[PDB]
Amino acid sequence: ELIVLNVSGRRFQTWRTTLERYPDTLLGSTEKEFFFNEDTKEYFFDRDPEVFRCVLNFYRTGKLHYPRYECISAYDDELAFYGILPEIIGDCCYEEYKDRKRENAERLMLSFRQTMWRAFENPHTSTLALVFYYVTGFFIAVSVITNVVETVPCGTVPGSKELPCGERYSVAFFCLDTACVMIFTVEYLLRLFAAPSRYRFIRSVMSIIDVVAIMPYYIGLVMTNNEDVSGAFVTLRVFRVFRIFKFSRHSQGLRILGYTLKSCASELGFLLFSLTMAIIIFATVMFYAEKGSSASKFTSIPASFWYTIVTMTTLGYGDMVPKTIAGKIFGSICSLSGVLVIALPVPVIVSNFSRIYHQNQRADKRRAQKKAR
Amino acid sequence: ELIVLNVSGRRFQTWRTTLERYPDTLLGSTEKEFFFNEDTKEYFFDRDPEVFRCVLNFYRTGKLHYPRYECISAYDDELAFYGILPEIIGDCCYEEYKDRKRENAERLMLSFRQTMWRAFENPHTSTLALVFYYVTGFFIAVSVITNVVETVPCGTVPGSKELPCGERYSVAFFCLDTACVMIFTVEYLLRLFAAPSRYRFIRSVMSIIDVVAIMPYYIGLVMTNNEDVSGAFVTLRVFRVFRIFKFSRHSQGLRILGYTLKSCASELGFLLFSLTMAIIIFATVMFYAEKGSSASKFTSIPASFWYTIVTMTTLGYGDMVPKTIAGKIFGSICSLSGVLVIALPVPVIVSNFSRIYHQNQRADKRRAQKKAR
Amino acid sequence: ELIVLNVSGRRFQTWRTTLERYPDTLLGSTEKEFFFNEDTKEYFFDRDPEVFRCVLNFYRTGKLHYPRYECISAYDDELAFYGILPEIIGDCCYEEYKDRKRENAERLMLSFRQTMWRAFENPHTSTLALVFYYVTGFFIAVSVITNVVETVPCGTVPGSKELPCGERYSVAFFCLDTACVMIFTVEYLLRLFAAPSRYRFIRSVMSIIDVVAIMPYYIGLVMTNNEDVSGAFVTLRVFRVFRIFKFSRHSQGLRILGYTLKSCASELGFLLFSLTMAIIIFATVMFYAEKGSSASKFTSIPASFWYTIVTMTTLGYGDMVPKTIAGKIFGSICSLSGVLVIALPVPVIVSNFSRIYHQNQRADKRRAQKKAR
Amino acid sequence: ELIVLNVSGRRFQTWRTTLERYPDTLLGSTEKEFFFNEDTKEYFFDRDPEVFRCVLNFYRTGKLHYPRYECISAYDDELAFYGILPEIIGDCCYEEYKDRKRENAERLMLSFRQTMWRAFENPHTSTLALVFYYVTGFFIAVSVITNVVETVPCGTVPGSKELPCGERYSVAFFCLDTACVMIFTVEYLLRLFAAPSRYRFIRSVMSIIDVVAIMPYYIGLVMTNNEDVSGAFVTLRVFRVFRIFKFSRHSQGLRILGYTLKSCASELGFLLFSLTMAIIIFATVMFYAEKGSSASKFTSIPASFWYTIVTMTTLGYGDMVPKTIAGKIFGSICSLSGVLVIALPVPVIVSNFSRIYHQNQRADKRRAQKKAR
């Protein structure tokens, strides 16, 4: 019999023979008979009249399709109402289904201890939180500036030789360094004592940055100039520039950049690999071409790595240049090849950066909008 | 009872139990009974038969969705006809709703005084407006060219030493400067006297540009060579190049560029910040690597700022180059890191520029089309 | 009365009061009564049942909307069937209408004389056309190569001084030049005699290129070395490189590039203007900063144009570099500003180039497909 | 008679006169009478009620359109059910039809011998396959590193002169080279013996790479230092860098890069051509401008090729720079023109690379998903 379905007034009609093709759901089985007012002998359904279309099209073909325009939320609701599973969705239209679900998910995505642990993360909530955030971000800048300046040679001092400031006003800089390092270590200990998951903290990246920015001060004390060689402390002063990364707490762009750098590890690894092999190839070619010349600075393939990496980036210092015909031809080819091989990661990197940036933008916008509701 | 809705002939049907779920609108309440010709006992409605679908889907689920394709103008019209609010729109489809409304809004976006104030802004309307616009844009070019040329050393003059023109033909250039500055100040005073909101004018950017382009002439008169030091007037001649920005009135690209530069202040601030910290990091590394060398021009970290900023931009002058292995490795890394950190703002900047450009294009097109209607 | 419209079986229904709102078309007037079989008292219409929706929505609101998905061809057909005009389309959805019409239009876009004029343009049709096309494209390459080579200094010739080939083997190169120029002029005269619109030819760009590539040979004969100055013939040998543009007939990329260069004249003009003013500003700043130095090559603002244009392009030769603090700061700013101002035209230029390229691609594809039908 | 079509309950209605316009399909002919239960005198059809719309719209207009949103799989199914052909699809909407079909196709896209031939291609299936894959990828790196290092001049050896390692420890490097080449040739012979289509193998690119990476060893043995000139063996050591391309088996990025390089041969050819002609033009101009100068290194147009190719790439070594006014103007123009002409292929190249990359990504994702079903 031509069983008729006036689903919310829209009248479809089909043989029960095909309607029973898969009775392991609402309409195929016999529990739909609850809505079966035989006053009309039609299964009058108060559901959407345009999602049932895919239902009886499934019962016709054997698989259900997925149209584009309608909100996938109502789609999922109505397919769940009939007890049909999104897994059964034919591969005719399946990948954009996953796409829409993914982006829909992204759209819809204590007395003393927790007081501190909520003041630290969210500075704008409290006002003591700001007077801590800004005062600990000011000393970072102070330490950065004094580390930069302790190297400026200033003061002609005719009585003695020419000296950099950092070793002329020794204690005046030692006190600045000690003050900023003491504030750093105190605020770090307050980060620690207030961290609920004290093991998840030590394992985090920010704690590593903080401890590696602090230690070059104490290690400097244990290694006083009595027992040291002036080539093993340069590393300490170099590591003392890691206390510029503490701005990651105050800046959002830096954290977004870290996120998008770890999000693109595979393309970056391939960039490193392809760059390495291009450098080796072009360095071998340029070395054997420019091997014998007047004062050829291509003394070795390692010594040609420098020329190759300077040319591939279109830097072109000009201290190592070819002088033969083959050297010129292959330097020419090398520049273009480098331009090509370096322009591979840049697109996806900047795309991911802009995407994460605007995603956080719209996320906090929608969050404020929903909390203002 | 299965209340039936032949809305413009399309027949839906639902229980009143769910139809009364929210009677604070047209169909839920009892004022729809005006259209209730019980000659059919159906609320015959002469509205669109495909927007009512979302209505009764709201009355089913509890929230209404937003389909894509149909013009949101008719959508808003028909949701207002039923007295339902766009605020109630579920977050299932809400952000593209705001999107469409925004871009729809962008699409559908006196005897003597006002005579001058309408001649000034719109030069093409009158014809005296052109004979003022072009004649005041010609003297800008004259002043630019004479300021450029007053520095060319021309004239061998064997009897005396070698002189630049600007100080050989002193009065011949003084007269040009005076003429162009007098025209500038007169037209500026006419801008002022004709400005309805004389306070909004002085506060504007164009008035600032004009006054800072004019003052270096009068200040030059008060500071005659009797009481001056030749190192405090160079600033005056430098400021005399700001009278090239007056082309902002004649050019549309310059104003669009200013708009898109102020529209992207946050990305630009982050570019400045990230560039600063990258420069500091790489300058510290390169200074401690290249510290001890034959004639190492890395005498200080400030002195290494120059190398770092020249390398990060792929400029590569070649006057400061590393000479050790570590210096070379880190200059290599520095070039790539700079290429990366500089390619972040460029995409969004050029995108916004093209967008504003074409937006003004299509805007004046549609304006002329609507005025020709 | 509730007049009912079972348009192709889809039943709408409306009052005649609103149906008569605009009787200057098919349904508003009374000529629809032809399809009015009062056997049903319903205007039974065999048209699409989903374009009539916009019709009665117009008769409701007062303006008709334009949905996205359906082919605008059928849309135009059915709106013409009802005698309604696309002009009346409300601005609610009007610009994408023009968009779709435009791209639809782009999609659906002799005994002896005409024999030659069809052989010339389409080389692949005939086979004599190829033996003319390739033989006249071979002599272009011959002339290019001989012009390049006549300058190579080759032949040590111990008995005499060092000479370039072009003046050592004088007649051997004169004969090559004469042969290629004679073939050029003969084929040009055949272009002329076979051109139907002989005035549209002389006015074309290709004819200009051909005549300016030919004349430097005859003008060279009238200006024999008896009456000449060796500084007025260098221009002739320089112009003799315009006969490399004749490859425009054999290459499609060159013609596409010319099309996209003339298609982007406004952005190119603005690039030239903005570049000029940036150069002037930064040249003034760099000149007044670097004015007084040891051997400052910033002798003049014109002399600083060179530094500025070399820095803004990230070229960085390194022959003119700043040496003061202000010079360094402003060269640093200049590099970034140039990177910014040069990256404005590049996007739209390459986009237009790729677009025209692929448009011609798909155009000849669809043309071959339609001719194979 | 107004023949009515309640296709799955949706009621259309049309005259048979137009229904017989093309009786060479299901509905036009008389075999539809099978579904013609004259209990209703309507051809009751259990098909989709929204694809039949295009059917009777074809029977109205004479051509059928193609709407966007619905899955083209069901579209093709239902047009095949009525026996209508996609060829007949009017050009009103035809190209996006081909588009959708193409991307749908891309979406839905032994005892001893075959044991080896399945171990080789798929290393992750077996575990002996890994112990072969990694052990043969380790010796590639060994050979690369030893070829690079045999050129480093290391060992001051005061008793004798300065020597590179490769000729100081002769046999110690000969043994490394022999070992790696023997492993290479053995694994290559196992590639061969296990290849089912032994002719398709030798013709492949990987076999060419392997044989050209191996032969420079045996040819080195036949050409022992007894009968050789030291300028004909440098080519051998240069070719010995092709055994770095064998990483194509271990890397996926390299194979994707080869695919996208051969996929873009036409744009690359045009890049080469346009670059060549730009170089010739600017070299001629720069040569005739800079011809007569103090120590002008523009001795010839071939000698100016170097300047032109260094400037067009924004490399800017600075060893050849112009010194006249015309030379400067045209070098300035040359830099911009090169930036333009080089930025043409880069977009499409990187786009194709990212596309192939992500296509393989989603392809293996969907393959694993389908095999997990």
Side-chain angles (χ1 to χ4, degrees), chain D residues 16-72:
Chain D
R16 177 59 172 144
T17 82
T18 63
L19 289 174
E20 76 159 36
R21 281 167 48 114
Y22 303 95
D24 293 331
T25 43
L26 201 159
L27 71 161
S29 87
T30 177
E31 84 258 2
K32 71 180 189 310
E33 270 65 5
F34 171 52
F35 305 103
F36 186 38
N37 58 93
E38 314 202 18
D39 294 294
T40 60
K41 204 263 182 184
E42 87 187 8
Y43 304 84
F44 177 83
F45 272 37
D46 285 337
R47 313 304 307 191
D48 161 72
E50 293 210 315
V51 65
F52 194 92
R53 187 167 73 102
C54 327
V55 181
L56 80 163
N57 276 117
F58 166 88
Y59 273 76
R60 288 184 194 92
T61 294
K63 59 175 177 312
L64 74 164
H65 298 248
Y66 157 68
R68 305 302 185 279
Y69 49 85
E70 79 269 17
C71 183
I72 76 160

Side-chain angles (χ1 to χ4, degrees), chain B residues 85-136:
Chain B
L85 203 62
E87 165 180 356
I88 306 168
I89 280 184
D91 204 13
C92 69
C93 46
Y94 193 92
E95 72 289 4
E96 72 270 30
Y97 182 47
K98 295 283 185 180
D99 166 281
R100 299 301 209 285
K101 314 182 322 157
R102 177 198 321 162
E103 287 109 23
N104 179 263
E106 324 181 342
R107 157 158 35 89
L108 315 179
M109 162 185 75
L110 195 135
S111 179
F112 202 65
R113 193 181 177 99
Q114 276 64 252
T115 69
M116 307 183 313
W117 188 249
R118 80 175 297 274
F120 284 174
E121 273 77 341
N122 311 112
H124 292 195
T125 66
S126 300
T127 77
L128 194 83
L130 275 81
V131 82
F132 168 90
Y133 161 92
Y134 280 96
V135 81
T136 194

Side-chain angles (χ1 to χ4, degrees), chain C residues 144-153 165-166 173, chain D residues 301-302:
Chain C
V144 159
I145 284 179
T146 180
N147 278 325
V148 163
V149 172
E150 80 169 2
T151 61
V152 167
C165 297
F173 279 95
Chain D
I301 299 174

Side-chain angles (χ1 to χ4, degrees), chain D residues 14 20 32 38 70 72 74 95 97 111 113 128 160 186 194 209 217 228 236 296 339 346-347:
Chain D
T14 303
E20 76 159 36
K32 71 180 189 310
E38 314 202 18
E70 79 269 17
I72 76 160
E95 72 289 4
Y97 182 47
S111 179
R113 193 181 177 99
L128 194 83
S160 58
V186 168
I209 293 168
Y217 180 68
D228 65 340
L236 260 50
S296 73
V339 173
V346 178

Side-chain angles (χ1 to χ4, degrees), chain A residues 109-165:
Chain A
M109 163 185 75
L110 195 135
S111 179
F112 202 65
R113 193 181 177 99
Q114 276 64 252
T115 69
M116 307 183 313
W117 188 249
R118 80 175 297 274
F120 284 174
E121 273 77 342
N122 311 112
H124 292 195
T125 66
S126 300
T127 77
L128 194 83
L130 275 81
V131 82
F132 168 90
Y133 161 92
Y134 280 96
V135 81
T136 194
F138 161 85
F139 273 80
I140 295 169
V142 167
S143 70
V144 159
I145 284 179
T146 180
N147 278 325
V148 163
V149 172
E150 80 169 2
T151 61
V152 167
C154 201
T156 184
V157 60
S160 58
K161 79 162 201 171
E162 208 303 334
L163 295 145
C165 297

Side-chain angles (χ1 to χ4, degrees), chain D residues 57 102 143 152 165 257 297 312 316 331 349 352 366:
Chain D
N57 276 117
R102 177 198 321 162
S143 70
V152 167
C165 297
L257 194 143
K297 302 197 230 169
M312 286 179 55
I349 287 186
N352 274 113
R366 276 180 65 252

Side-chain angles (χ1 to χ4, degrees), chain D residues 261-282:
Chain D
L261 275 190
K262 93 172 300 297
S263 176
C264 295
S266 59
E267 309 51 12
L268 260 52
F270 172 63
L271 158 70
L272 185 137
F273 180 69
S274 74
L275 205 68
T276 313
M277 55 184 313
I279 283 183
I280 292 180
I281 289 174
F282 283 119

